[PDB]
């Protein structure tokens, strides 16, 4: 699982892979890990699918009633607090890493990370899942804060592609959603149109020289790909 | 598995069942639990069947070698000592075997019990196996030295039958051997249910 | 990692008056997949009149078959070309199974063949070589399903009727075919096809019987 | 299980015997402790187990029987009813928080017509009871290490129409066999009997 | 370093054996440019699922045995059946020493017309069939290969076998976590065994039920 | 295990307008035979006969609960319970203790007195039902019973032929089982009459 | 056990095997695993048969009560929510893997519910021990907007893949077609494993088994 | 440990007694098995443990003593020398592959002047031996469950100058105490004595 | 531990961190994980320090005698084979990940990876250690094969800096060595002159807004850094 959220000037972009895997078999290759909480607030879920689904459904139910009670919109901080409380009271029984990202008219675009421990950190960008470990040095080198909306979406897709190119537990479709003062816009790009994969990378085209032909010299001359040669 | 052997004025009586149960399933009902070591020595099967068979075959080979080298038959004390020494050498190798060596050497009848840990005891009455707890009750109550051959055979057959009737791991065909000065003879081989109908008629 | 693996399958032998019917199911399966539906390694010919049938681990029975074959060939060399008898091979099998008592073969074996008089005999073994003779016998996954059936139709116990005449080759083969057909419909680890070996003094003949593929 | 209890029912009586052993891990605390509790005038139970659970179970059963007799105006309960009540108690214990009663029971009794309208059991009754709540009517039953030793012996020697003296001799033989074949020392066996006249404590056999 | 699944099928005229060119280190896709199919002798090829070090050592041991026997004595080169027999005996001997070769190997070969296809486990199990698979290919690809074989028992042509092999590779890429869309197919025929260049299969991710709104959990 | 502690085996077999339900007689403690005269069959009414197998105390407790339930049903509903309703009630009772399961495994046979249709059921310890049209069996000798019934049963049997098949299967299955045996008890239930028979067995 | 679900042009096609194994031995050869949920909703089950039966029966009863209350037809999302809440409440100890298929006013709805409570709505799904071998078939022949015949044949083939490659599945293919108006359940749609080599039918004349006592009770 | 061995040394003798119990689990195989092995004309050992190791150890020690007597022209070894030889054997066993001898020993003997030049021990000798290789000269010693029961009793009643008859009565009291207080049935106790005339098997006490 | 080796046209560059850590305490902060085998062949060691040191010393002793025996130079493949054999015969008793990189006149510059399993793979570049997991996506995005010698050294130093910026088990000095047909040249750059660290990264300068001042509004206005304010 690879999930991330990046804030730009207007709002936020949430990106995720689509792969639910039972260890080494792909149970689902078209999952949707970007779960709607309110109209402008979403969460990226990593870990136990049942636990994260139940947590998201409960938080969405709580937030929907709260809008009717107060008669106004909900800030991203409220949803972040709801997840933080619900994950902290159940931290020993659930396996969940949550990213709460959204737009509210008061604080603009917000991104919150709630790891397995149950804390809540407000960040410019957040990463999560097994494939997030591959992206940290990718963000330290290639990520510049202050990108435009389209630039942020493209960077998020490229980061997700780079993450699941190396992570066996991640892969499949790349799903992104943009949340800002305008209408939220989703996008799903397939693997065959992904911004990066090692199969299309020209520097991994040449195979490692492992199957030496039987030769009278120590000179390495490529792999043996024929019986005669 | 239930086996018994006792010494009386007239020799030794050995009696066995013929059931091997791999846990809950009955593997066979025709197992030979009396192992004829020679024409003059008898052994019993209890515990690991393979261990008993292999090691009493080894004992028979050593007894035959003793006879060939020395020109005379081996004694039961020496034959039981060979098995006990072999078993004691393997006491930490997880053997599972409880046997009885019964014979009539030049010092009269003699009966030994040898376990899987090198023990070798010499008494006039033994019962071995999971059904022994049922044999002893019938065997200690009717045992006396001045028993006839027919009476001793009847007592052993009845004790084995009563062991097979209450023990789930024991059953099959009750077999009775008699060891005398001239060797041993297979006295009887009777089905257990027919034994029930003979003893408890009607 | 464990050095052992059960590949399933079942074998069954019935000894007649002047013949032996040996049978083994041709099905090799791994952890949860199915390696092959045409595995013929369960039954191995040692002499023109003696056969062995093994259940359990396939590699273990391959190794055991090689050891038996080379011991038999050594015996033939050391006895002036005299082929060993069925009982000699049975005792040798017991001895060699017990020799590996501390690292046992994961095989359950049966040695079948003809006696000196020509009458058929079966031998069954545990993992460590506890031999026992009998006129029939079933080993493997479906043994508990077919052995009581052979007990009822052959011994004819609890039947207040005259015993039928002793069975010929054809009736024994039909009975064994029924036993395997019934086993294949209730045991999930056996049944794609059964190989039958009919061993008489006039050579040995082989036959193949179709079973369900599920 | 260390202490062996024996019971057998004849045409006119039931004889039970219970070892009086009480021990602390290898130490014989006493060898004369009566483990046969009289429940009713014509009912008793021989119980094997450690002192606590055995005493608590027997006292609970006896007190409940007495309370039922009080609330039913002195109407004595049949042996089957009492046996089923004990079985229900034991079975309920094994699924409770406090756990199962580690007590094995041989329940003996004699049924008499409570009134002229009665048409129930009239002979003697014997019931084997496992600690898990098993109940089975048996001609004879045993608990403990020596139990099997006795059982086959009974299978060899028990008859339905044994007299009181011959039954006493049979019980003496069973106790002797237990002393002979069990490594656990059961020197004294506390024999009692139930007949149409009630419960008698037999001192000849021990 | 561990290798993924290997599949193989016999066609009317030879054998085909496909495997991806990836070595993983746990869940890490470590090396995507590894030639996993190795040529043994002048007639056979092998590919192992599982540990790559054990496969390397075993393949070196097997290849040394063939060449040295051919060179030291004026004898014919070992038949593919004999090479597989030696491989199986070596693997079983490793198992009996409690130092197993933790691999599942698929072995193909052709000599003078006869085709040989077999598989061997890390513990000594061996079998031969018209279709072999190791790893997740045993659960994923093997049913499809068996169905393709049984829809025409007269024999598969090379094109028909290649088509179903690519279909199985596509499904394996769909459903196996530690896999990449880069495969090599070795073809064992009368002239010898020839390993093809790495290629990829075309995939489909545009199902109407895969969209954001139908898969969303609101 | 707990299910094999007491031993015992039960099997029901379906005739045309009839069914034969047969149980062994042995009751023991894991090797030792406490009694050889303990059948495991219970009659609910003129149409339903069921047997229990497993821990004997659980058998007795569950039988008492079933008797309570059937008597209450016949008191409330002025009618005899049917086989399907009885099987469903047992399924619900067994599933109520889904995490505290009873250690029984019932085998229910029933027949419609007006129609003649035969209904067989054999649930797990948690009530998972199983309704075939040939036979059901539970107990320590379940595998041997399954093999014998598969090898001997045919659709259109008469009550006598069905009884003979059931007796042979039961005896042959108990011969290979150390926890079952000591004869058998069989009940042949037809549309018009019910017959009870006791069948000779080995004393082993 | 192998259960398969497929979304086609208009409706959902569900399929299952009929073999029930009593712990490595075939208990029943014609078990029913396609359960009733609503007039427009069905649910195949895999895993512990008791748990699947109990949860399906309870949710079907709840749906019937709810349709009595509202007067509308039940929505597949409602059944999915009820099943997933119940399965999550027990932390997966109610081991039942469900394939839920139905048709509503919103169109066909196919989903899987894991024993732990997670749900996945997909065009084609597999569950059970033989699911993987089934899934490899679906990934090889599934296309959007299939006709009823194509979907039925694909489901039957995917079930047969688990039938022959899984020891826990076989003996029939159960097929159920659910549309907006009609729900059809075919039991013997495919019977690849027929009855071969019939029984000998060895006769046992009445009286071959000795009887100790007999009691006849006329009714 | 199940079988209790007792020993006490007086002015002119050493009396030892060994229970004859042999059991397979809770079953009394026999109650008359002599566990006192005579090593030399004036030496013996009472050994507690299971039959195999006990018999092997005693036979090894006796055979080695006989071989030494053969190679030393009939020169009999002193009690201290034999005790140290047994202690060395037991201590070597606990650090060997085959493991330690699970045998507890009470070694009794009487030392006599081997020649006119001898100036060594003349009275009786008693040694306590643990299975680990402990060796200690004691006035009295005990092994088994009843050992402590006897030991205090000896501390109450033992005197250095007891006569043979009073020593016999004391041993009878010790055996009675073991039978009274130990749950393990030790019915027969196999009493022997060592005096200046050698080894005597005493049948009065059992 | 972060180790890597990258091949350029002339030869190879070997880069490593300098940190031996006993779990969470830094036992050594100036380690040298680039171990000389021959003049032009080196190894990067990760894992157990004692095991890797013994392996390298034994292989170097074996190679030094081999040069005298044959009277010529040693190929990198020979050293790779020596490590592969020695690590495969001891794979169950040692914890070692080895990179064998060097120059020989026959095959030019060569890089071999020998992981904990005991295999040997000839690669253009190799990564190893706990910090290598952070570099894979860094190489997939920023590494272009065919760089010059100075470019390769700079890229290796930048990669090591990015690796130990995120890895707690890596840090300290960056040690690089260049092996080619010329004289091998070493370099040690300190942490205060490292090409990258998060402390000097301008995008991590602003602290996360976690310590909200007590306010009458939901507007987020920064952290509270004063008692009065
Ligand atoms: C002299 C003797 C007396 C009773 C014996 N009893 C059992 C036995 O298994 N008893 C059951 C368990 C407890 C009660 C029923 C086993 C014995 N020897 C034995 C048999 C096989 C292998 C090793 C030793 C015996 C030898």
Author numbering:
A (entry chain H), I (entry chain h): 55 to 283
B (entry chain l): 100 to 301
C (entry chain m): 126 to 339
D (entry chain K), H (entry chain k): 1 to 206
E (entry chain n): 2 to 219
F (entry chain J): 2 to 205
G (entry chain I): 30 to 248
Paper text:
Our starting point was compound 1, which was discovered as a singleton hit from a biochemical HTS screen with 3 million compounds against Leishmania tarentolae 20S proteasome. After rapidly screening different tertiary and secondary amines, we noted a steep increase in activity with the latter (e.g., compound 2). We could rationalize the improvement through the use of computational modeling and the subsequent cryo-EM structure of compound 2 bound with L. tarentolae 20S proteasome. The newly introduced N–H (R4) is masked in an intramolecular H-bond, retaining the desired permeability properties, while at the same time restricting the conformation of the tail-piece (R3) to fit into the channel pocket of the binding site. The main interactions responsible for the potency were hypothesized to be the aniline N–H interaction with Tyr113 and noncovalent molecular interactions including π-stacking of the quinoline aromatic system with Phe24. The application of the cryo-EM structure allowed us to identify the minimum pharmacophore. Guided by a cryo-EM structure of an active compound bound to the proteasome, we were able to rapidly optimize the potency of candidate compounds.
